[PDB]
Amino acid sequence: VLSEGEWQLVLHVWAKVEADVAGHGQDILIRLFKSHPETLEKFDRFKHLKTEAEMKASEDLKKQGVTVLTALGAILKKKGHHEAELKPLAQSHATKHKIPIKYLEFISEAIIHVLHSRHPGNFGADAQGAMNKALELFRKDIAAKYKELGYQG
Ligand code: HEM
Ligand SMILES: O=N[O-]
Ligand SMILES: O=N[O-]
Ligand SMILES: O=N[O-]
Ligand SMILES: O=N[O-]
Ligand SMILES: O=N[O-]
Ligand SMILES: O=N[O-]
Ligand SMILES: O=N[O-]
Ligand SMILES: O=N[O-]
Ligand SMILES: O=N[O-]
Ligand SMILES: O=N[O-]
């Protein structure tokens, strides 16, 4: 359970993300695909992309980035009261996309990396700790739902 102070650190850095959600989504997905290339194989629309330059030029990848971060933003803004938002997401990622929890850990690492790089004004150690707690809570609750849904993850 996060404190209100922890939520405020999370939402203060998120507010900077929201100044340019598409840019941040590109940087995050590219970092994920560079760091864990196996994750790219999950995305049929753009799994053929071979290089970071190609990834930056992909309008499809950019749209996906916006989709992911907007969904996560909505969840963060709930400050842990995110049961309704998590249901469809867990279902799709468990049953349609087959995303293991391990890959949610990878994207969480990618998020933290990009925020640390872009937002050192709002992403010092305390803020990073808060965001890690928020993302750990997200993963824990998604993992619980995966098990309910029948997916080992
Ligand atoms: C912060 C974590 C994540 C959030 C909030 C998120 C959110 C979403 C959303 C909202 C969609 C569109 C609606 C849906 O299908 O549920 C989507 C689609 C998808 N997600 Fe995620 N996602 C996350 C992590 C991941 C990860 C780590 C992977 C793969 C390694 C993944 C793979 C996909 C795929 C394959 C699709 C379908 C894309 C397409 O239409 O071609 N997601 N995700
Ligand atoms: O009050 N911040 O844990
Ligand atoms: O693209 N991140 O090293
Ligand atoms: O971009 N992962 O949905
Ligand atoms: O707490 N949401 O499953
Ligand atoms: O969206 N991750 O289950
Ligand atoms: O609900 N899964 O696309
Ligand atoms: O970013 N949470 O997988
Ligand atoms: O991709 N995270 O270090
Ligand atoms: O941000 N999920 O607690
Ligand atoms: O509640 N544990 O994923």
Curated annotation (Swiss-Prot):
Q: Give the Pfam families listed for this entry.
A: Globin
Q: Which InterPro entries match?
A: Globin (IPR000971), Globin-like_sf (IPR009050), Myoglobin (IPR002335)
List modified residues, type Phosphoserine. S3
Query: What biological process terms from GO does the record include?
Result: removal of superoxide radicals
Positions binding nitrite in this chain are Q64
Keywords in alphabetical order:
Cytoplasm, Heme, Iron, Metal-binding, Muscle protein, Oxidoreductase, Oxygen transport, Phosphoprotein, Transport
Q: Which residues carry this modification: Phosphothreonine?
A: T67
Q: Which PROSITE patterns match?
A: GLOBIN (PS01033)
- Transport as a keyword of this entry, yes or no, is yes
Annotated function: Monomeric heme protein which primary function is to store oxygen and facilitate its diffusion within muscle tissues. Reversibly binds oxygen through a pentacoordinated heme iron and enables its timely and efficient release as needed during periods of heightened demand. Depending on the oxidative conditions of tissues and cells, and in addition to its ability to bind oxygen, it also has a nitrite reductase activity whereby it regulates the production of bioactive nitric oxide.
Give the multimer and partner information: Monomeric.
What family is reported? Belongs to the globin family.
| The protein's name in its UniProt record | Myoglobin
Q: Which species is the source of this protein?
A: Physeter macrocephalus
